Structure formats: C-alpha cells, structure tokens
Amino acid sequence: VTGVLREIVAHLREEIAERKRRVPLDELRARAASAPPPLDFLAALRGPRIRLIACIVGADPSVGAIRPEFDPAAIARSYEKAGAAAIGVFTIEDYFRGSDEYLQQVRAAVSLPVLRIDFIIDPYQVYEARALGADAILLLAAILSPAQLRELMALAHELGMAAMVEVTDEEDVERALAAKAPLIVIINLNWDTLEISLETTRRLRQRIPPGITVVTWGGIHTREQVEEMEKLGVHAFMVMVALMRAPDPAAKVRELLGI
C-alpha cells in the first residue's frame, strides 16, 4: 500500500470504524448467520470449457439521468440467461450510499453464485459480504500481509464463501502459493503503469501448479482471446469493461462464450 491506494485505504479505515460503531461485529455476525445460504462458487468455476464471470458495477454512472432507472437485477438476469457461470458485483460502498443494495438486488434476482468485488482489508468486511449475500470475496495478495491473507481466507471458508486471491506479478504468485489458495485470479494490469495486457496471464499462468483453479481478469473482449485462454488451462474469466461498453451487454456474453 502506497500512493493513491494508500489514500483509499486511509478512507476505508475511517468508513469501517464508523460502520463498526453503528453495527458492531456481534450484530453483523448474527445478520450474516441468517442471510441466503452460500452457494458453491468454486464449483461453478470448473467444467469442460472455460466459464464466464459477468461483472456489474454496483453504481449508476448516469446518476439517474437514464430513465427507467439503473436496474442491475434485470442486467444480472440477462447475463444469467446468456450463459454466465457467475455474477460479479463491484460495490463501492465507501464512496456511494446505496451500492451494497445493488448487490442484494442482484442476489435476489439470480440463482448463480455471486462474487463481491471490493477492497477487503478487515475481517469485519468479510462478514458484511456474507450478510449481503455474497458467495465469494476477493483478496488482494499484493496488499495483505501473509498472516492476514490466511486469516481472511480461513474466515471466508468458515462462513461458507470462496476467497479468490488476486495476483499481478511473480511475487504475488508465490504469496498465494504460500497461503495455499485453491482459487487464484490473474489481474492483467501493470500496477505501476496502469497498462492492461493479456501478456500478464500468459507469462504468469505457468507458475501456478495444476490443481489450483485459475481465473483471468482484464483485456478480454474477443472470442479469439477466450479460446486462447482456454488453451492455456484457464478455467474462468471475468469480464467487466467489455460488457459496460457493449450496446447489448447480454449479446456480448453470448459472443464471448461462442453461442
């Protein structure tokens, strides 16, 4: 953690302390115990052919200027019809009020496993994701200490959720291999230059032994790329930017799955 991400962390700490005040762990521990019971995310992620995780940003970039209001429930449903193996919801709760409600509306609308994409630095946030209906969380191996990585993985496992461990480089990969993570996502982003490139998963995928399920995220927008990743042993891919920019996102899901 250093730079703009350091400034984000600083804000996250404030927000988390404020939330703990209003809803202490004990109250949230109970809430999570009574949420929709967790589906098996990792299982959805491995069949004969590479699987699609379709990601929704939990926020209306139009901020209400589009009428008929932003409706992620209907969006997720159309992704599910189009063959998506799982839905991802990028929540931005620390910067927008109702973001987490969008995660709940998606959870109610689909039968697929739901991955919550946010920035987890505290055990209290794993409980929050469970209480909102998530079946999986993300963990940033470049950010967390090797102790917190294992503690957060184990607590997710304790609550019934899968934890996908993000890696960006060779040093992140060894840390995830050290924490014995059975589920890794390669983020195709140079964290220094903010350069997106498929070359990251191409170089790094081979440093992950067979047995661990590999997911790839970033720079995928053609069916050619999807077949290339499937040739690489990659069991699933996440798409977010390609969907947000398609004139018909569900049609892009079908194109990416070759349907």
Added chain:
Amino acid sequence: MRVTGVLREIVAHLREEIAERKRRVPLDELRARAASAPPPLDFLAALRGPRIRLIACIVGADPSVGAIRPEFDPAAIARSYEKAGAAAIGVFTIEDYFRGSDEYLQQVRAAVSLPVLRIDFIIDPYQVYEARALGADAILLLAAILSPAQLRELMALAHELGMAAMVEVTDEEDVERALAAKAPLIVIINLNWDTLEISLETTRRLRQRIPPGITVVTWGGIHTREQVEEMEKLGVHAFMVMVALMRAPDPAAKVRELLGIGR
C-alpha cells in the same frame, strides 16, 4: 457505435448536471464571472521551447475524503512542480461527481504563475465560460465525441475568451478532423479506447500526419527519461504526466528526472 454503454451514461449525466447548473448560475451571471477573472496567460507560448516541455498534472480530488492527515494540498503540490521545472500545470476536475473539485483548481491557480490547463469533459459552451471563471488558461476538446460544428464552436469560444483549446486526437480520423478545423494545438492521447490499453504507439503512429507549425502534445504512458527523449526526437513539443507523478515517492524529483535536469 461511437457513444455507447457507459460513455453514453456519463454524457447523459453531464447533460443533466449542466442543465441544473445553468438554472442556478445562468449564462449572463457566469459570463460576467469569466469577464471578471484575471486574464488568461498564453498557454501555447509556454509550450514552445527548444526542449520538450512538461505539463505536470494533478487530480482535483481527494481519494481519502479527508482521512489522510495532513490534508490534501494541491496548491503546494503545484508549487513543487513549478519549482522543479514544469511549463504548465494540468488540473483534472471531476465536478460532475465530486462537489468541490473546482475549488482545488482555484487553489492551484492562486498558487502558481504557470499557465493552468483544466482537464475535464467539455460538451457545452457553458463549460468553457466555467473554466475561464475558475482561472483556466487552456481547455481540452475531445474531437472524437464532438460534431464538426460543435468542435469549431467550442474552439472559437475558447479563442474569444483568450484561452487555448487543446484538441484531443486518438486516431487518424480524429487528426484529420483537427486539421480540418485548423487547430493550432493538438494532444495525442496514448490510449486504445477499445481496450483501455495505454501505449505510446499512438503518438509514434500519428505524429507524421500533423504538419510542422502545429504544436503537438503527447499524453499517456510516459514515465521514463528515455521515453521523453524519444518524443523530443519526434518533434513533439510537450508531454503531459499525471500517473507517473502520483506514483512517485518524491514527485518533484520525478519531474526533474523526466526533464533530465538537476536543481
């Protein structure tokens, strides 16, 4: 489809925010605000040197929302960039999703004597008067998104207010649009919009299509002295840096390193 999905949603939010701002601050009030401000400095002149010039860019927002102790202070950051040798300061304002992003541009403007470029998303003449009332000496115009009439209308409004208008180009079609509009100042954006992939290939591929006499800026994926020297060798007159300055431990030393100078 050029304007689809998320970009359509942003523009739609902009259109609505501009209409609301217009009703609270009408054109004749804002025109007098612009006319009241100290006059814009010459931004084009700051970019014509014998060496390539650095436009050092600051984001006009606090991602910590106040949690960072010592509070975010862009005035002092801009002063450090000026001291280190920048030719101009760019301020990225996000006034359509954060409230007082424009107050940071005013803080920067009071703090330096360099020309100040306002980096934001201009689609309406109202926003050109706004940038001038906030102290801007230059604006950006995205040629790929404006109609030819709109592009020419916004360039002429900027000129009539004494500001420079930097026309952004992303590909060969954009360049021809800019040259057809007789733009004196063009910035090549080093970004494949399709993938959100950043690369200097764009500037290399498009620089020869722009005749001498037109001032060329390059923006995106610049972070080493060798890249700066290569662009200078291409006759590029200025470069914008934002990302590399924020990741830098000492941002003022990085400015000096990109210019190849000491103190």
